[PDB]
Design an enzyme around this catalytic site. Sequence first.
Site, PDB file in Angstrom:
ATOM      1  N   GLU A  72       0.607  -1.309   0.083  1.00  0.00           N
ATOM      2  CA  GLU A  72      -0.016  -0.022   0.064  1.00  0.00           C
ATOM      3  C   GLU A  72       0.762   1.283  -0.064  1.00  0.00           C
ATOM      4  OE1 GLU A  72      -3.138  -0.310   3.008  1.00  0.00           O
ATOM      5  OE2 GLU A  72      -4.345  -1.783   1.715  1.00  0.00           O
ATOM      6  N   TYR A  95     -11.546  -2.973  -0.302  1.00  0.00           N
ATOM      7  CA  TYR A  95     -12.698  -3.163   0.848  1.00  0.00           C
ATOM      8  C   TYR A  95     -13.903  -2.916   0.316  1.00  0.00           C
ATOM      9  CZ  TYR A  95      -9.014  -4.346   3.670  1.00  0.00           C
ATOM     10  OH  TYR A  95      -7.667  -5.306   4.143  1.00  0.00           O
TER      11      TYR A  95
END
Lengths: 591, 591
Positions: B407, B463
Amino acid sequence: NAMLYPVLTQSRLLSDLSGVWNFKLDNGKGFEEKWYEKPLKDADTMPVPASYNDLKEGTDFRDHYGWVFYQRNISVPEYVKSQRIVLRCAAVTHYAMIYLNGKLICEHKGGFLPFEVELNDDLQDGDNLLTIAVNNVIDYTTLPVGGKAPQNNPNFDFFNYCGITRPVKIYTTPETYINDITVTADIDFTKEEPSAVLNYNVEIKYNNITCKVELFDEEGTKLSETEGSEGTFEISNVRLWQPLNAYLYKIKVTAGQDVYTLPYGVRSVRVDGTKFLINEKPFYFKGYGKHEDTFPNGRGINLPMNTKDISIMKWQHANSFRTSHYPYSEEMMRLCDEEGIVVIDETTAVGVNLQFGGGANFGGERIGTFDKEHGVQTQEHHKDVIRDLISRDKNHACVVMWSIANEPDSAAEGAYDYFKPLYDLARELDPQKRPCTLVSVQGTTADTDCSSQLSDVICLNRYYGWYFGGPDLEVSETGLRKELSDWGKLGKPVMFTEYGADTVSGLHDTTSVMYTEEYQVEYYEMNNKVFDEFDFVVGEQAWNFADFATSQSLLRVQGNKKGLFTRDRKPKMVAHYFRNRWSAIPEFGYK
Amino acid sequence: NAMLYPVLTQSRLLSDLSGVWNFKLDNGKGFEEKWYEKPLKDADTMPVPASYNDLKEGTDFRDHYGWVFYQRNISVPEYVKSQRIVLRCAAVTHYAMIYLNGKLICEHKGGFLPFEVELNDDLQDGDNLLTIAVNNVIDYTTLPVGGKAPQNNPNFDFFNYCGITRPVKIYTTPETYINDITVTADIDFTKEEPSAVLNYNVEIKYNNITCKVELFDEEGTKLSETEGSEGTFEISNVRLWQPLNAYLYKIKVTAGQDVYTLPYGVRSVRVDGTKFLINEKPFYFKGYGKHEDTFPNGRGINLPMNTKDISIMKWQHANSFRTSHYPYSEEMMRLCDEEGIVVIDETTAVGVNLQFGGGANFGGERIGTFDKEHGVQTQEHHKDVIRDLISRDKNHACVVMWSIANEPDSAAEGAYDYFKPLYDLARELDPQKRPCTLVSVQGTTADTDCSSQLSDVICLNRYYGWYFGGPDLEVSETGLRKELSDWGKLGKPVMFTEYGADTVSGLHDTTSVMYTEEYQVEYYEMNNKVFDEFDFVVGEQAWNFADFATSQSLLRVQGNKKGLFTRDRKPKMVAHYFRNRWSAIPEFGYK
Ligand SMILES: Cc1cc(Nc2ncc(Cl)c(N)n2)c(OC(C)C)cc1C1CCN([C@@H]2O[C@H](C(=O)O)[C@@H](O)[C@H](O)[C@H]2O)CC1
Ligand SMILES: Cc1cc(Nc2ncc(Cl)c(N)n2)c(OC(C)C)cc1C1CCN([C@@H]2O[C@H](C(=O)O)[C@@H](O)[C@H](O)[C@H]2O)CC1
């Protein structure tokens, strides 16, 4: 016979064999096909040290009956064959058979005590095939005891975790070596600044050579010197090892081309009347009965959890526990020395009672425990265990007492004659002549318990308010006071080594019921109220410190939930109750 | 540079230093008062290996800022000084400073990779004072990255576990030794009975001597021999290492007075189109992102839990995981070799994104991640880490891919220029030219992600249905399909390396809400439905395998509860859902 804790020294190495070994479950044909000679075919992986029961999936693994095979390659450089090469097994559970290249070189019965074997003769330059086979069968000839009713049937309330429980290492020594070391202490308490004299005694095996024994304090300063296989020091103004306040002198014992150091704490243990005296002050046991139990190691050693357990004790204001129901790791024992925790070292002798499980019968006659032909065949081995245990832990200042057995059928025909030889053997082999006990199952009374005579301290496991009387805590109180009052008449010291109530973490009620956290707290309030009424009660040890695994049955909610803490060490409500009670209660002078 | 896993060999010893060391928390005046020279006064105990943060009570310990001091006595017999004596640190977290008698002999920045130091020069006949000091500070110059806002501020979602994370051992070698070993494989798949040729290459350091390299199979049979620093074998009808079906040849490399063996598995890794090929078949990743996280070891190594984790995977019908977010233990890597588990080896490079935590500002200007003066100072070290990692794990047949970072702010000004040098350095240092990737934070699109160009495989952390869209799984579905459809246009292979939904084990509802086990199952149904629509999706890895610890905050219910399993490895309901889905889905040909 003698077993000193292997460490790193100028004269000896330490090669931990821990890691992922090869591993196969026996199918029966294992020994036939001499698997120990060949490397295991279609093998599996298995970390050592650790119980194997929980490290794979499926009941076929957890619930296996019989033998397992560990294999592995070991190799030493020829430049080290100058020294003697020994394989030490910290503990194999239960029966170990050690091959090397295919040649049985050792055997040990006894699942919780160390045992070694010399390798020089069987070592073969190159990579070697080390195969340790392990057996989990328990019956009337093992300690602990396995019951009657192809599967084991533990006559004890914890799970039959097996495999290589504690580490397997290799160490060396010069061919004339230190083998045992013994150290005792007479402390002169009359002085304003107490001082003391330590008696030492080294044993060896070209045994004629110089014997240097130097003494240091914990900082590292040297304080004295002496020569001889036996000798003495006169530590003046000595720093007494105390509970929750440890001090460890060091003892560097040079002899020939061999050095070994041994931490040692100076303290005195003596019973007197209704008073258990450590350093001639009146102790009170605050603590619990423990298990070497964690996920997923099973019974395998867990140095991280050992330190975390001790942290929690110092947080809870405890000072003692008991190695229920088998000796713990040497490492945990050493740690209690440094950390100042009082231990009640206890043998593997659980399940010699034979009324459990509805009992076993013979010719329509229910067998008695100590029946000579149909009962426990365990005194031969029970004696070996007293020997190995005390030879191992004799020097630990933290061990203040010996537990010969847990909940034996001590009020039965044959009981006194089974234990007398065992106590005697204990009070004669312990250089410090330490108190001896056994933990009395519910049901025994002062009049009927063979422990009333043999034991320096009375240790009760009582469940007034759980199995007996629960959920009526008032009635249960009257029961406990009545029995407890009786035990007072022996004039010996009484302590509870086990009391408790299954509690599933999370279950609550304002008006409590059994299994809730509220009931568990109330149960300990009632018991402790009665304990505090009698000045001969010198100790409370809850059962248990933490939730632990058991064989399945209706009475066992995914294990034994009597812990003050969950199996991952998180506090149940009772843990805070106790922490607050133990805070307002000292190590000394509570009576 | 080069770091082979220390084992036991005819020519080298292995002395594990693990045990209970002395331990003191720094107060500031630590280095001033040169505590490393004296033995620590008023010390404490601490097992090694293990993170220290959870092994004592009180926030002052868990939450400590700065330095800690480990001490210990080490001693070698003079009869071993013939060989070279090296101290290997499997991993110290984060910064280590190693003294000996009081003389700084080493330093290492990097909290998850091994590093060693020679001892011959500084060893002093007798007992020696070994002091390792450890530092936990993280900032813009460390990997992982520490944020801005006396306390650390992890710019990553896991707890800052520190101390001596992996074991500290001592091993030896003849003064001219094997130092590295490299082994590659070209596999001929045209034949009916595939065969292959292994290229080897040994490095040494009186370096002129004979070079024997023998090859055995797993049973132990010898199959070939060759001489030379470089050479070859022609294993015919070779046994290919396969996922969930491992085979390990052994490679005994004799050279001078030194032997070393290395398990090795023969397999091929190649991308092609939208197809991730292992042994020229089209793989599908089934598995999870993991942490080296357990109670109470923290990040410390846990060989029992490693085997238990692998058991659970084989039970769940998984085949891969990813070393989020740092390299794992060598032992776990070796285990994946034997057990047949596909690994995505990943660097410590988490938290280089700088929009987290509401960001940091400078002159009223919000800093960008790769700002040259005010942003991440981590490429120097980020490059060291790519080097150390691949030098360590190059030979592991289980590593099929490299993750450069987790990330990162990969769609930002400066991103491409930060990572290009790092990928290049990765594709040039890996003897097997293995695929390279990075894990893309939510927000990036195919058009904007510097990973669309540098990466052989696209790895998304998404997500939809948790942070983005939850609790509306329908809307979230449309979102996921829309973004996923886009990524298809690159023609590269796409896999999800992270998706999940916090779930507190125990919470249920027939009509689900967030945090219940029912919601967690429904969230994975929705995501997986969309995954299965696109034939370029070649892998699902849930986040996370198990509940793990984090810094406290409102969003973190006693840690990260996104695990399929509780922190003690017990299944949440979703674990059975996945086990059933993965059962009806093969390792090969799912597309
Ligand atoms: C429940 C029970 C009852 C009786 N008596 C009896 N049972 C049923 C009926 Cl119908 C009846 N009329 N009487 C009993 O004694 C008789 C059977 C000889 C023994 C015991 C348990 C055996 C184990 N212990 C100790 O406590 C721990 C725990 O139980 O949690 C164990 O884990 C731990 O090892 C152990 O130290 C407590 C009592
Ligand atoms: C929740 C969030 C939101 C945004 N975006 C955003 N936040 C708030 C607002 Cl108001 C807004 N408009 N947008 C976001 O990107 C921006 C901040 C750059 C990042 C992330 C989390 C950072 C960590 N991850 C990964 O998932 C695991 C987990 O979260 O459980 C971690 O453990 C694991 O390390 C990690 O791999 C998921 C997203």
